[PDB]
Amino acid sequence: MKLILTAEVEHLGAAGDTVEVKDGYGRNYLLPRGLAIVASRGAERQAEEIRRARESKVIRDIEHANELKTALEGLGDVTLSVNAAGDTGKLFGSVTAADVVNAIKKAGGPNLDKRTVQLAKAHIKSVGTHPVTVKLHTGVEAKVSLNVVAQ
Amino acid sequence: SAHCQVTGRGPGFGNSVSHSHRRTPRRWDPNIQNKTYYLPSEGRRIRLRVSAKGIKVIDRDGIEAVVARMRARGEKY
RNA sequence: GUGUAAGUGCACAAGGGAGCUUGACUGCGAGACGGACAUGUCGAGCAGGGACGAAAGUCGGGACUAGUGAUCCGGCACCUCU
RNA sequence: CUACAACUUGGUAUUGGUGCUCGAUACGGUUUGUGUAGGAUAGGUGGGAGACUGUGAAGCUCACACGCCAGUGUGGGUGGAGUCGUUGUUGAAAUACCACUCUGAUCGUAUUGGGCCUCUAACCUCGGACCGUAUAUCCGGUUCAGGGACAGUGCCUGGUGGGU
RNA sequence: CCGGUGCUGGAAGGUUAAGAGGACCCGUUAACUCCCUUUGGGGGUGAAGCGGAGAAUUUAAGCCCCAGUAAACGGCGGUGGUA
RNA sequence: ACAGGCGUAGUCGAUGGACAACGGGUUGAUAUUCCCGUACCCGUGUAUGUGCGUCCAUGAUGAAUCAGCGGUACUAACCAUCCAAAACCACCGUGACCGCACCUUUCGGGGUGUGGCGUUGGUGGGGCUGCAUGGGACCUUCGUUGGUAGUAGUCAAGCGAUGG
RNA sequence: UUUGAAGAAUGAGCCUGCGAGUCAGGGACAUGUCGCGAGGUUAACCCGGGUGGGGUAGCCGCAGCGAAAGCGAGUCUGAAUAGGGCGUAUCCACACAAGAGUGUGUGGUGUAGUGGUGUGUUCUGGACCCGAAGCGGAGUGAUCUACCCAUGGCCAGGGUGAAGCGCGGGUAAGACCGCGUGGAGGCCCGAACCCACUUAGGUUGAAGACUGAGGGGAUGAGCUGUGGGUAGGGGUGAAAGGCCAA
RNA sequence: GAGCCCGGUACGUGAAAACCCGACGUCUGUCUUGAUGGUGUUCCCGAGUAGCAGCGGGCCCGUGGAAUCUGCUGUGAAUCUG
RNA sequence: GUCAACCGAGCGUUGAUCCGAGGAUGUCCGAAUGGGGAAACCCGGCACGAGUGAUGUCGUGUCACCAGGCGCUGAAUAUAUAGGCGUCUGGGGGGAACGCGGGGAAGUGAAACAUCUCAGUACCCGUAGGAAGAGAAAACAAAAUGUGAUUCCGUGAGUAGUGGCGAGCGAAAGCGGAGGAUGGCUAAACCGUAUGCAUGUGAUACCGGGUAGGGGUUGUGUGUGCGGGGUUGUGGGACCUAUCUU
Questions:
Q1: Domains in chain A and their CATH numbers?
Q2: Which of A51, A92, A128, B23 is the most exposed place for a label (fewest CB within 10 A)?
């Protein structure tokens, strides 16, 4: 399995490397963790490796970082870009978690995980202003104040 | 069997042998297994009945692709 | 006595002995026997190329009859067939 | 007699990581070429007129060892300019520098493999707990704990086989 | 009574499938060197490649082999002479 | 392979469990079934009245605090223990090692007891730094009570499980 | 049908009716007949109210020998015209050679097959007709009988008198002994009931496996009822190769 | 035993409604913003597939020298000098 | 109506009886479908309506199962999912043969028999249709300057061949014919697109050059769904780039 590493591993090398390894290793251990990527294309593999490396470096957190993000979760109003019909007051399409987290990227700063976003508690597809909360800690969770771009 | 799911590599029915024949089949099964996988899209673990061949197909083709191809066939996965 | 059972024959020797020696060949074969059929048996004579012999002539295994097994399927050498 | 079920053996896909040990393959410096003339195991071989030394050498005792035990090269260290130039003998010349590199024994580097001690992430759990579930010794899902690349299944293969 | 057959155990050996290997050869031919009448036909070497049947070697169980086992199937003899 | 095989929820299934009627008379034929008489078990209406509690509120409970007495006790830090960081003195068969007289083929190699730094090495005790332990408290504080705050709320006609 | 049957070898009660060499197919071979004649004939199909017209793709003949290349009234083998094999419709007339059996070269006479149909035999198909035991596939069946499950019921009557318990003797205490109670038992005699040992009868039966008189068990490894389950190379079997709808 | 009795035939007639054929006009698209040819090189021409090996089926073909077509496993390529 | 008469009572020129096409009603079982069930018979729910002094009763409807679409929720558990609730459309079974894909015997013949044959037949399964399936060359052929989708019929051919070279099986090419549509539609390179998982030259790039505001038609990636372009064999096509430019 020709794949491009993302992190450092025993007897393979370091991040960014290119290795031909055993198929099952790459099948079961690395590739389903987001720790590697198939080598199918030059620029496709290059871009994926670069972006995945940046995101893996930037995704980390600790318990105390959660205790601090529990305070920093009361950010300013992070707005969301929308294409919908304002005719009746219903939205065409549901809006991603990437969109919310990239809005936080370009307004507040923290580039969080789409996973922990309680978007279900947002209940998008009703035109208004949805609240939000996120599994920051085991026990501690803080809240964000939000608004929507009228369509 | 429960039948394959990604390709449709069903059985077959052989027959005779060497050392004088005797006429007599022996199904040539396919090699299905019970490997599981993970759908990052919908956040879920799926178990399938897939041959090693089909695993090959997956790892050089994706899983989303495969479930869409199976949705076509409307297998009750 | 005849290599080996028995018979028919062998002294005119097919018995015994000595010298050369490879016909213990190739290509054929008139006419005949015996014959359910397939098998089986002899066969003069012609040609090349030889043996022996001075020559005539004899030699296509053994004095004769037994000593072995069809067809199919494969194997080896040679062919100016495909 | 021939064959089949069932059982069983091994190879292979599922099916991987590190460590050790035992093989041969190739990139690599290496041990090592007893024919008399005679320092004489004369590495055969193509340029070929100095020979590497001094970015520290003879003869050397000793760390070493083979051994065709006459002999062979190797290193702490003195030594501080020593054997040597066709040394001359020859099919053939140095064993001077340089080198395509073979009959060799050793050993680094990619490997190709196996066996053994293990980790877990595939896989298995009629082990537990919770949920779907109000009822469910079913089934599924999450999780804990455990086993573990073994087992199970598929394909090829050898064997026993009146069980049929 | 452990020889015969079977069961259990243990491999120092011998035979031992598949698979991994792929030496050496045989087909084909890019390219040459002679033969000949001439309007190139017939001979030899014949690179790599593609193919053919392929050995050497490494190969487990089993079998042969070594012991145990009969409230396991099973088996248990004769002649002669002397008071 | 497909046909189909099993099977949980559940649903059917008495040969059993629970559940309210006995005697006499009658026709040409039925009879605990109709008739005569006396009884019983479900439900359902109308009305009668004895006690009824919701509204009134009649009695009877808790929340839980600001906090006071003494005490788990990040704990600033305290009462007793050893071992070994660097380690202190005494001594003992010392890798190379500096080296009394002699065995020893007549000698280049095979050594010994005392002798000296080193102390790859060995035993003993004492100023000893790191160590955690049980005991008593201080911060946090958890245990015992005065106001309170059984005040606003709360239980009290009934039927009451498809649950125990 | 038998060497041989009036045959005491088989078959037939009698009548009436029914009941066994057939058809397909350009099939094969042989032979009659008809058309054509070195030629013969079409198939599918198209057109046709009909049985008729067309349709040249094909087949059979017209030259064979040889494994084959290949050659050709010759060819194959072989070194060979040197013999032979096969073939050259057959006869006829003249020659030359031998009478080892006749051959060889000329001349003329000139070659007859094919398509319909009929008959006989024949090939493939059930192939003159009737007749098995038994093989395979898919299903039906445990209401009889074999066994198991779930739930109820039945076993008159009379005897024997285990364990235990009590009293008494005995004991140092026991063990032990006697009297009583208790009333167990794959216990006993005997009806119902379940079986079926002997024997007689029946034996074109009352009966497609019974009756009469006797007999075994008869509180248990019981008999039975209602409902249910196991199904064919499979079930079930206190096991006989027994039972699974006479 | 019927041409001339009857029923009916040869022949010609007949459908308010439903059904089927086409026929139309609706309705629907669809090319119209276009084409013929030129010219030198990069890119594409249907991937777990075709191919090869191991067991097998069926093809005139019974594993045979055995193509083409294929089923299960295992391995596994290129895009037109393919 | 009739076997099938008898009796009684009636209707009909105002057009009956009779025939044809469409409608209505259409008890109960049956795929059977509210639940259940020994088939045609037992019990119910919900909305409405009729009815009783109230209950009982009665009538009209509707309630199964799965597959898909849409809608609400997203349990363990965070994303979120399986699942749950509502609505909408389908399927469900029967059939005489005919078809396609799959499975798949045996008696028979071989004078035995296993390979073979009987036969890939019978039978079984899954799905159809009025017909099915196949079908446009990764084909045949042999140097002929050929053919040109497929299928079904005739012949080739009982041949070449295959085969315990035994029984027996057995083509195709080619040729003549029926019918003709020598038929069409897509993917990919390449653009324009909505996007969706990612990131940030955070800039000399997103476009027709150029005169240029911005300061990103997101800057660059990558698959997804839509739209263009493209459908070939003597190769074509998309980029490119001239020419006439209906």
A1: 2-58 (3.40.5.10), 63-144 (3.10.430.100)
A2: B23
